[PDB]
Every structure is written in structure tokens, then in C-alpha cells.
Design a protein around this ligand. Structure first.
Ligand SMILES: *C(=O)N(NC(=O)OC)c1ccccc1
Ligand SMILES: *C(=O)N(NC(=O)OC)c1ccccc1
Ligand SMILES: [Mg+2]
Ligand SMILES: [Mg+2]
Ligand SMILES: [Mg+2]
Ligand SMILES: [Mg+2]
Lengths: 277, 277
């Protein structure tokens, strides 16, 4: 029941109420136009009020993924695309320049609409903008933003992964290898994305998934449990000891630790060939 | 030069090396089959080694978005879909049941292959599985996993946003509304996701984007700066004061704080109507 404008790479959804000249509201960090609906009610007698879900939020939908460069802190892709979305929206609703109000990061989008598409702007209002670029003390504010993001995204991840390693009693050879930063900068960023994905979407879901001891017993003739020789004392080995205790399925010891198939591939292969070759 | 199998909702990419019966390697948290290539080199005279990029990783690609529910810690969509991928891969490559080895969370995928598609399994190996569901101390391990994930996600964000609000001298009323938990577990998942997105993809990129005072002066007749009456002393108001000092563009005071358009919609509208009505 929201309105839709199909744009390059997204379906932009927006609320529309009232009659009269167009007044576009651009949301801040919440990203969604619903926050303006009580205000639009007060204005709907004077304006056609348009409250946008910016394309990354709410009921708007991307039709292709964000470019990889958007994670760079100096990327201008998103802010320019958001501004162009507003301009295209204005042109789709009005043959005349429109009224625009943005708040917070939405006021920065509004600044870029005026810069890149001044022809669509009749009047514009910047409500409490947090932009720092043109300030005399820009560096202080930029560094504070960079440091808070770094602390949240990087330090929090680093410390919780160390805790996860300690909780499972992972061996030093595996700990040292699982945390090795990738060589390239492309590999460092992908490694971060993969870790955050595994964290949110894999670890809890998979480790508490629906496997019972009875599932092992039905096909026990097919199964080998493998324990590394260099990862003794770790939690996964205790899982295999419990399966063995309750099912009788044999444990075969195999060279290396948790990552033994890449630490000691010759010896790992030798055991697999003894099993199955 | 990876191979591709096109499946429901994904293009599954894999390495294939060697000759002989099919041996599928399922990766753990790294998600990608390249970790098995040194091992494949040792096995390639005895097996057709197939080392998979699971569909959410590496050179595999989704062709449809994940379900929204996949972020739920109780979801089993992904592990079941991973297991179905391996079964379809086996049937595409072999008319006999195949050999399968999984490590870490890949061993859990392997367990679901055996459970749901035993007809594709000749022999299977579970290398160091971290599954806890059937353990006698399952609650301890499940609750640890949930606690570490929550700590890395949600909580590190909570602390950084408190520093952010102090650094910018955000009004308590605003910091209160901005930080209010949603009244649903799932609404809270969504709200954390939105903050995490804004942190990584918006705050740095937008607040240090390319806007100069010259961009304002060119169109000063069109611009109003808005300061809330309930957010005095905060950094966004200092930005407006600087713009006004240097350009003469007027500041209008408007009811509410940083979120005044929803806190005080009638008073906010009255000012906008005075400006533009
Ligand atoms: C704007 O809405 N926000 N940004 C800001 O004030 O300075 C960058 C914001 C709103 C809610 C949560 C976090 C930031
Ligand atoms: C498997 O590869 N991992 N899981 C595990 O041992 O218990 C859940 C893993 C690899 C790297 C980092 C964290 C976990
Ligand atoms: Mg200052
Ligand atoms: Mg031998
Ligand atoms: Mg708990
Ligand atoms: Mg909490």
C-alpha cells in the first residue's frame, strides 16, 4: 500500500498523503518514512507529503547487491545514489521544483540533492545535520567516527572470536592459523564479511540443529568419526567421544589439528586412503 | 576455473580434481573448497575429489535472497539447504552413492546429508563436529554460543553508541528514543541489523562526504537550517551555527529535539507552515 518508483538497482517505496505542492521528507539513520507520518497529517492540507524509505531500508528493495566498494569509509556511492533517488522521485511527481526536508543523515542526502540536482529544489531545510567535512575541526569529528566504528566492528569481533576459541579449547596451531590475516586487502575484507556471516547465520543454527543419536545408529555402518592428533582436549573431540560412547561408531585418529587437512595433507590423505581407498 | 551446478536459489561452485569414485569435501566456517586443494592433490589418483564452496560463500552465488527468518538463531533453513545442495551435487556427478567428508560446521552439513538423503551416501566421515544438540550438557554449550554471538553483535554496538551519544552531546530524550528496544525479539534483530548497517555503510561515508560551504552559498536563498529547541548543546546544532556564521543562511528554531518531527508533530508543522505555507 506504499507507493513504488522503480529505479536503477532498487524499488524505492514511499508514503504519499495530501494535496498541493510536493514536500519530500528524507529520513535519517532509521531509514524509513513512517517516522514522518504524524507530521504529514498536520501538513496534508497544504502539501502533497512524500515520506521515503531510502533504498537500503524498510520496504524499499535492492534489485542488485551493493558494490563491494560501498564498505570503504570514503565511498560516495550510497550518498550519491540516495540523492539521485530523491531527484528522480521529485521529477516523477512534479513538473515544478519541490520542497525538501532531511534530518540527520537524511539532511546530508538533502545537501547532495541540492548540489547535484538543484533544478528539482524549490526550497530545502537541513534539520540537525551531522556532516563534518567543511568544519574547521573536521579531523576531530572524522577521527571520532572512524574510531567508534572501528571499535564496534573490529575490536568487538576480534575479542569475541578469541573467547570462542578459548571456550572450545582450540589448540595453538589452529588458533594461530584461523586468525592469520589474509595477505591482500581484498582477502582481509572478505574474511571479515565471512566471519560476521558465520556468526549471525551459521554457528547457532548449525550447532543446535536437529541431529539425534538415533540418526547415527540407523546408518552406523557408513560412518567414521575423525579426531586430529594435534587437537586433543578440544570440544569437538569430546563430541566424537560422546557419539562413540553411545553408538559404538569407531573414532579414527588423523594427523593435524582442527585444520589437519591443510596442515598435514600427506598424512591426512594416508589415513583417508587406509579407510576408503 | 571452477565447475557450476545451478540449483534452486543458488549457483553452486566447486573444485573438481582427479579420477575415480566421487569424494565430496564440505568446508567449515571458511565456507570455501580451496582449503582442501592440497589434500585433493594427494588423493587425485584414487578419487574424483569435489571441494565445494557452500552457497553463501566464495564463488557460489545466491540467485534469490535468504529468507528473513534465517537470522533467527532457531532457523534450520540454511543447514537443510546446504545438505540438499550436497545431495544434488552427488546425483549430478555419480550414479553410485559417494564418499563424503565434512569438517567443523561442514561435518554438521554432512550429518544432515546422511539423515535426509542417505541414498547418496556410500561412506561418510565427520571430522571434529561442534554440534551440541544431543549432548548431556547441551544447555551449557548452546547458551555459550548464544552468549558469545550476542556479545559480539548487539552488546558491543550498545557500548559504542553510548560513547557516540556522549561525544556528540545528544540530548537524553533523543538518546532514549534512539536506543529503545523494540517490543519483539525479531524487531530487535531488525533494529540491530539497521544500526550495524548504518555503522558500516553510512556514518563515515555520509558525514565526511564532499559538501563545501560554497555549495550552500550558491543557493542560499533556498535554504533553511533547523535546530530543535530540546536538543541544545548537541553537535548538529554546532554545525548549523557554523554554516550560519559563514554564510548568513538563517536558522529557524523548531519544537522537539533531534527527533522533533515525531516528538512534537503539531509544533513542528506549525513552524514549517510559517516558513513555507
Ligand atoms: C541521525 O538521525 N543520526 N545521526 C546523528 O545524529 O549524527 C551522526 C542518528 C540517529 C539514530 C541513531 C544514530 C544516529
Ligand atoms: C569450524 O571450522 N569451526 N567451528 C568449530 O570448531 O566449532 C563451532 C570454526 C572455524 C573458525 C573459526 C570458528 C569456528
Ligand atoms: Mg568543535
Ligand atoms: Mg595405506
Ligand atoms: Mg544467555
Ligand atoms: Mg541484549
Amino acid at each position: 500500500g506504499m507507493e513504488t518508483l522503480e529505479l536503477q538497482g532498487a524499488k524505492l517505496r514511499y508514503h504519499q498523503v495530501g494535496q498541493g505542492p510536493v514536500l519530500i521528507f528524507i529520513p535519517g539513520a532509521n531509514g524509513t518514512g513512517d517516522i514522518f507520518l504524524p507530521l504529514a497529517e498536520q501538513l496534508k492540507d497544504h502539501f502533497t507529503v512524500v515520506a521515503v524509505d531510502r533504498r537500503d531500508y524498510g520496504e524499499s528493495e535492492l534489485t542488485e547487491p551493493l558494490p563491494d566498494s560501498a564498505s570503504n569509509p570514503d565511498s560516495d556511492y550510497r550518498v550519491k545514489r540516495d540523492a539521485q533517488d530523491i531527484a528522480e522521485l521529485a521529477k516523477s511527481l512534479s513538473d515544478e521544483p519541490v520542497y525538501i526536508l532531511g534530518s540527520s543523515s537524511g539532511s546530508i542526502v538533502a545537501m547532495h540533492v541540492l548540489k547535484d540536482y538543484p533544478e528539482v529544489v524549490k526550497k530545502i531545510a537541513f534539520h540537525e545535520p551531522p556532516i563534518n567535512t567543511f568544519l574547521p575541526d573536521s579531523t576531530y569529528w572524522k577521527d571520532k567516527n572512524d574510531d567508534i566504528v572501528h571499535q564496534i566492528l573490529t575490536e568487538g569481533l576480534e575479542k569475541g572470536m578469541k573467547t570462542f576459541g578459548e571456550t572450545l579449547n582450540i589448540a595453538p596451531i589452529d588458533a594461530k592459523m584461523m586468525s592469520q590475516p589474509a595477505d591482500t586487502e581484498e582477502g582481509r575484507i572478505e574474511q571479515y564479511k565471512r566471519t560476521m556471516f558465520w556468526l549471525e547465520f551459521e554457528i547457532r543454527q548449525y550447532t543446535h540443529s536437529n541431529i539425534t543419536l538415533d540418526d547415527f545408529t540407523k546408518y552406523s555402518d557408513k560412518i567414521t568419526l575423525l579426531n586430529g592428533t594435534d587437537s586433543r582436549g578440544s570440544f569437538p573431540q569430546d563430541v566424537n567421544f560422546y557419539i562413540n560412547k553411545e553408538t559404538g561408531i569407531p573414532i579414527v585418529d588423523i594427523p593435524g589439528g582442527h585444520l589437519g587437512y591443510i596442515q598435514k595433507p600427506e598424512g591426512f590423505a594416508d589415513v583417508l586412503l587406509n579407510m576408503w581407498g
